[PDB]
Design a protein around this ligand. Sequence first.
Ligand code: ADP
Ligand code: A9B
Ligand code: CL
Ligand code: CL
Ligand code: CL
Ligand code: MG
Ligand code: MG
Length: 267
Amino acid sequence: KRQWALEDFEIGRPLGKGKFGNVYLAREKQSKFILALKVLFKAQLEKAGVEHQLRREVEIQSHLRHPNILRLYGYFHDATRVYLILEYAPLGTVYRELQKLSKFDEQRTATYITELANALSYCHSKRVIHRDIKPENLLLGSAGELKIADFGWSVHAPSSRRTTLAGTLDYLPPEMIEGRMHDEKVDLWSLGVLCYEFLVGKPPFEANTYQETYKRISRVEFTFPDFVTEGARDLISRLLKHNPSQRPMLREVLEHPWITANSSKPS
Ligand SMILES: Nc1ncnc2c1ncn2[C@@H]1O[C@H](COP(=O)(O)OP(=O)(O)O)[C@@H](O)[C@H]1O
Ligand SMILES: NNC(=O)c1ccc(-c2ccc(Cl)cc2)o1
Ligand SMILES: [Cl-]
Ligand SMILES: [Cl-]
Ligand SMILES: [Cl-]
Ligand SMILES: [Mg+2]
Ligand SMILES: [Mg+2]
């Protein structure tokens, strides 16, 4: 196992920005291998006190091996920055694709859900829960296949939350926003939120305010536009249950009649 440094890479265009992450296209000099370099500033990490999140990200993501999960090859650091060496996803984020098209048709949506459920089934078999599934963390490979990334919030179930919720509440279940304890079922709630957003163009509990978004989530207040079909409604309604134990298993999602009728990929 080699010990990389910044000197081994030629840096290219910015691929995107996160709260801590500044991601660049890069090429390793000796092999000409194209990859993505996720740069984090140590000062910001220490200030926010999320060293443990970064360690989890490296440990968990580097060991997982699945076509629908982004690879992490390794890491290195200097006096001021930490660098994560990632698989490069050439077709961008699902987020960008959704902004381009406004909404996805039923075939595109069902295919994405199948790929997500496949990846999540792999994760949950190791009792790994992602907890931060949202469009900006879903990347696209050269064949347009979905890949889950950003495992900074991932843990082993069961678990409590010891870190401050930073941004949007839109994809989190009631048990998580209420600081209660949670398990694998949190990812299936998020899967329901995504399926809605893919078809409609916006998440089901969206509001102008943190406080009222919190209210809509804890009370599970959502409605469907007329164009959402009966099959889609059935799947979404099953996933967005307040009681975690009533949410279906991933096998049920993969074998749901609406998924099988519209997805172009299998389990
Ligand atoms: N491997 C990659 N290939 C292409 N783009 C990426 C890759 N990793 C990250 N990005 C872009 O950078 C953004 C931030 O990456 P992410 O790891 O989610 O940062 P953070 O952990 O700070 O949220 C993503 O939303 C995506 O647009
Ligand atoms: N497959 N297992 C690995 O560890 C692996 C495959 C490819 C790479 C890799 C690592 C560093 C750079 Cl710079 C470029 C490629 O690592
Ligand atoms: Cl080397
Ligand atoms: Cl936590
Ligand atoms: Cl979050
Ligand atoms: Mg992210
Ligand atoms: Mg992160």
